[PDB]
Amino acid sequence: TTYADFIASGRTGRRNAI
Amino acid sequence: SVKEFLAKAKEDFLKKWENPAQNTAHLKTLGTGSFGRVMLVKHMETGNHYAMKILDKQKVVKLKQIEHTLNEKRILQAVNFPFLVKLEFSFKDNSNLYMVMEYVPGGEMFSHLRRIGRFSEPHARFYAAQIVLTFEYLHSLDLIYRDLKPENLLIDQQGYIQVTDFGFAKRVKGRTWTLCGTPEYLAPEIILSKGYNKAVDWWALGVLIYEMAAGYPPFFADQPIQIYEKIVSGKVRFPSHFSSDLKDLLRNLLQVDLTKRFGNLKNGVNDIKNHKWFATTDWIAIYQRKVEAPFIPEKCGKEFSEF
Ligand SMILES: Fc1cccc(CNc2nc3ccc(-c4ccncc4)cc3s2)c1
């Protein structure tokens, strides 16, 4: 699912600016 | 009376912007960064609690953050809006820069959103209306925000939003070119190395609305470069629980084409405020915070002369 894909991305935590 | 409010707000802004307030005071840890930390402090004379940002002047210079730091404090001391943090005091000493601001105890929208999963559409709309008004305010001052995301939105004791950071904000009338922001929240024109304007904040609003209502952003991947590819393709898929009104609003915000993006058309912000998804939104009551919230929780002297 899209939810499982989100968890798999490793980008579920606080995101830094580039 | 929005035109009259915004003309008086611009008068109030420019006066403070042109003659910034300096040295308005004298000297638990809530967080840390590469050039400083944020502490919960108590003002001795009143017993009032505030958040104090302590910035190491040497570390600011080393990390090439002089202009961003001077600019952020300059904006903070000049703005006045219900969803923008109130800067109480600012001062410097031999070693550090200090910004004493309102303490926002609720923490980031980010934590509440990951905990709850996703927000219901009325809940997402309550926050989205506050961002609409804030960008309308900022954009009227020629201020581009450029770092909208749940991580940068504090929730106060009344359940309303508070914006504290302006690290990437820039006061510019036309185009700007800096590659800055967070990968998920980048408009396609920032990724494509072209000149861009305030419409990037309206793209970011689209990303924010989608993330609050879905629980995940419209474009994600394991690496930023793979996220940029999805953004520039603009292929957005919506969860089946998204209402017809939401999908339509998001199609218009997450518009690759600038001549079609909501907020960047002749009617401006009014294309967003008058959208069907916002029909039940009382814009004046949001501003007044009368709507009941759905959720209630000497070193480097030359470089910092203006601070
Ligand atoms: F000093 C720093 C330099 C560079 C990066 C960082 C990143 N860390 C943090 N930034 C903030 C900003 C505001 C608040 C805040 C304000 C008002 N009320 C409650 C919290 C807390 C934190 S913790 C800090």
Side-chain angles (χ1 to χ4, degrees):
Chain A
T1 63
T2 315
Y3 178 69
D5 294 344
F6 181 58
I7 304 306
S9 79
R11 288 214 140 227
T12 59
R14 291 188 77 250
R15 306 109 144 175
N16 296 341
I18 39 142
Chain B
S1 67
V2 172
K3 288 216 174 194
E4 287 179 317
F5 171 86
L6 295 181
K8 196 185 259 182
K10 189 173 157 160
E11 195 155 26
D12 288 350
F13 174 78
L14 260 5
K15 289 283 181 173
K16 308 168 100 193
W17 181 252
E18 288 312 330
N19 280 99
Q22 283 173 284
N23 192 45
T24 58
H26 187 281
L27 223 209
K28 204 155 177 281
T29 308
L30 312 167
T32 195
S34 46
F35 48 90
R37 78 191 117 152
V38 175
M39 295 195 93
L40 169 74
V41 300
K42 190 152 96 75
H43 190 228
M44 266 147 69
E45 284 284 277
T46 57
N48 290 332
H49 296 260
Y50 292 107
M52 174 182 277
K53 280 202 191 157
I54 304 157
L55 311 184
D56 189 312
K57 284 159 119 182
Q58 296 199 125
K59 292 198 186 181
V60 170
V61 166
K62 177 182 177 194
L63 295 159
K64 252 186 186 176
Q65 294 281 359
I66 303 166
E67 298 291 343
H68 281 164
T69 295
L70 292 170
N71 183 58
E72 177 172 48
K73 176 257 176 179
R74 200 186 174 192
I75 291 155
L76 283 161
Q77 66 82 42
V79 298
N80 197 248
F81 204 64
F83 316 118
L84 264 17
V85 80
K86 285 208 277 180
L87 175 76
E88 263 318 282
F89 309 108
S90 85
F91 51 96
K92 55 179 176 212
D93 61 24
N94 286 349
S95 313
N96 304 286
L97 305 176
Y98 300 90
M99 286 182 304
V100 177
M101 69 199 54
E102 186 171 317
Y103 174 51
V104 199
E108 296 174 8
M109 179 196 282
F110 183 88
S111 302
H112 302 300
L113 178 58
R114 290 286 178 273
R115 181 179 74 249
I116 300 166
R118 64 176 167 92
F119 299 149
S120 74
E121 287 183 30
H123 188 176
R125 179 193 285 129
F126 170 71
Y127 295 144
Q130 298 165 57
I131 300 310
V132 176
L133 291 178
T134 300
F135 285 171
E136 173 178 39
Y137 173 77
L138 295 176
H139 292 177
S140 77
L141 303 178
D142 301 301
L143 284 168
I144 313 187
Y145 188 67
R146 302 197 298 186
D147 205 21
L148 183 73
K149 51 173 173 193
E151 290 91 320
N152 283 339
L153 308 166
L154 305 188
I155 302 302
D156 65 31
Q157 281 214 0
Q158 299 115 263
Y160 280 81
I161 292 177
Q162 289 274 292
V163 181
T164 66
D165 292 20
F166 293 85
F168 298 121
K170 183 176 179 175
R171 176 160 201 249
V172 60
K173 232 134 182 165
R175 309 177 83 172
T176 204
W177 293 258
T178 310
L179 195 233
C180 64
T182 302
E184 285 81 344
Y185 283 77
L186 293 188
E189 59 266 35
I190 304 180
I191 290 153
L192 289 180
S193 310
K194 61 224 283 143
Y196 63 87
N197 51 55
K198 78 188 191 75
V200 302
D201 280 340
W202 300 119
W203 171 280
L205 173 69
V207 183
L208 185 79
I209 295 172
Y210 185 110
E211 188 176 337
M212 290 186 295
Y216 48 80
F219 320 97
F220 60 84
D222 284 69
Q223 230 64 235
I225 296 161
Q226 315 170 298
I227 300 177
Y228 303 151
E229 292 169 6
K230 286 162 175 275
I231 296 165
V232 299
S233 94
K235 286 158 192 176
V236 193
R237 283 175 278 274
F238 304 103
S240 76
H241 64 80
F242 272 27
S243 75
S244 183
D245 286 352
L246 181 58
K247 290 188 276 188
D248 187 68
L249 205 224
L250 293 174
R251 279 182 189 115
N252 288 115
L253 291 173
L254 302 171
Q255 188 48 266
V256 174
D257 182 11
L258 274 315
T259 63
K260 289 180 184 178
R261 195 177 305 156
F262 266 24
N264 200 55
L265 314 178
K266 144 72 86 174
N267 273 293
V269 68
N270 290 337
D271 284 334
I272 298 158
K273 302 208 209 169
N274 294 320
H275 195 277
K276 280 172 180 184
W277 194 69
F278 288 115
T280 73
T281 293
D282 191 338
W283 293 95
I284 293 105
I286 290 291
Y287 170 82
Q288 290 162 352
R289 304 139 88 85
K290 293 206 291 188
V291 176
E292 70 177 294
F295 174 73
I296 305 283
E298 196 208 35
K299 309 301 186 75
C300 330
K302 193 177 266 172
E303 296 92 311
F304 305 102
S305 146
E306 282 166 23
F307 192 101

